[PDB]
Amino acid sequence: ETLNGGITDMLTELANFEKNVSQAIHKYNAYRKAASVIAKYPHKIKSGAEAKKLPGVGTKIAEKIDEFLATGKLRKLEKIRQDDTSSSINFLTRVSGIGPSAARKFVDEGIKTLEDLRKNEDKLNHHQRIGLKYFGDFEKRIPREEMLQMQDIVLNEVKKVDSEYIATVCGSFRRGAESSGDMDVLLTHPSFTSESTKQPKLLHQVVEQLQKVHFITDTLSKGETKFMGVCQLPSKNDEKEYPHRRIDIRLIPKDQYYCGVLYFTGSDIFNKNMRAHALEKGFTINEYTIRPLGVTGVAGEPLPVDSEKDIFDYIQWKYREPKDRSE
DNA sequence: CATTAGA
DNA sequence: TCTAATGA
Ligand SMILES: [Mn+2]
Ligand code: NA
Ligand code: NA
Incomplete structure (x- = not known):
């Protein structure tokens, strides 16, 4: 949470970059489990090797871990952060309706700026047109x-x-x-x-x-x-x-x-926690129902819900006002 | 993870 | 039809 913080953050920087600027879903998936894992680890990572022992942490990452622990930086991280190209993709992506895919393409064509985006509204479909139109308002x-x-x-x-x-x-x-x-x-x-x-x-x-x-x-x-x-x-x-x-x-x-x-009321954690709870309580919860669990490993049969309460009741908990669904 | 646009 | 982008 704070002990392996830079480690994961550097990790998460890396990933993201592969995924967007590059179209390397693997490397990208790499940086992630690794970031996932080093994050669970209970102790101050002291070196690559220490990390290395970790499932998902290879020689690749471990290598980055050292440079990063050794000097408060990483070249790749510095080079990328600089890279006008990748910067550009990072940005266009902000438009509602512009995914990485289109960000690369636009860039390739040479659309890097918002203003670019403007002289070429035509290359843009309706979603992105609107997305471009209210770019300011959407960010607020x-x-x-x-x-x-x-x-x-x-x-x-x-x-x-x-x-x-x-x-x-x-x-x-x-x-x-x-x-x-x-x-x-x-x-x-x-x-x-x-x-x-x-x-x-x-x-x-x-x-x-x-x-x-x-x-x-x-x-x-x-x-x-x-x-x-x-x-x-x-x-x-x-x-x-x-x-x-x-x-x-x-x-x-x-x-x-x-x-x-x-x-949809969340929070992301309250849910999970709630969700994790129905499980013990002999249930299962997902976005649309709540089914009683059966011993065979699994089971179905959608129990009837009339309000947020029923769900609670079912799992036998204290109704929690939305205000405190905070976690 | 499912629902829309598009081409 | 598939493939992208949102949400979430
Ligand atoms: Mn919202
Ligand atoms: Na390993
Ligand atoms: Na976007």
């Missing part, structure tokens, strides 16, 4: 203060359309959080569950309304179950317009709401 944290006004808005229309729609804004926002990166609204309806062959309109109506009033301004991707767009709160009585925010809305079979909800 969402003040909870607005989260409240946005949630306010969603809920309302949602209800306005059908009164049967149930919506929840998940994420850190739900868990207290002072700010968040984007909003996640999970959604379901009663007319839609595991069997009952869809109702694409379900999602559509809603999105339609949102847009109708101008809360949603763009569409990144809209499918029959997952809409991914852009919203913005009414820029009041001028002098102050609001930043463009990312929003995600997803239809959910009423029969798996809470699990989903439980899940």
Whole structure:
């Protein structure tokens, strides 16, 4: 956590670089288990060999470990950090919709800067166009203060359309959080569950309304179950317009709401821990259900959930307010 | 780890 | 169809 800190960080730097700048999924996977492992190790790594003994740590890494322990640096790390090319990829990748793949290609073509990206909007597909358009707004944290006004808005229309729609804004926002990166609204309806062959309109109506009033301004991707767009709160009585925010809305079979909800509520650790817990308690939990465990090694049979509670109850725990799902 | 876009 | 990018 702090004892093998640089070690893993240097490790993680390395990996990432292979994966993105290079297209070396192996080396990249190398740097990772190694970083994974040295990280679990209970003692101050004193040298390559010491590390070396580790599963996954080879002569390659161990070698880097020395130079890094010997001098507070690494050449490769220094050279890479310098490398205009790899820098460039590191950056373009920031655009919503630009993966490494396209970052390399763009670069190859010679698009390195944002401005480059601009003179060639054409080479860009819609997602990246929008991604480019709101590049500034996408990088900004969402003040909870607005989260409240946005949630306010969603809920309302949602209800306005059908009164049967149930919506929840998940994420850190739900868990207290002072700010968040984007909003996640999970959604379901009663007319839609595991069997009952869809109702694409379900999602559509809603999105339609949102847009109708101008809360949603763009569409990144809209499918029959997952809409991914852009919203913005009414820029009041001028002098102050609001930043463009990312929003995600997803239809959910009423029969798996809470699990989903439980899940996307996090935290990443609370979950795991919760998850690790159902296990002893004779269960199993995943994003959509909670099945009682059987001795044969495994077992099925999706227990019925009406609220976040049932899940708790099942696993027999103290209902934990979102606020304290912190870990 | 599954859901959309695109080509 | 596969392959990328998001989320998470
Ligand atoms: Mn989010
Ligand atoms: Na080894
Ligand atoms: Na990106």
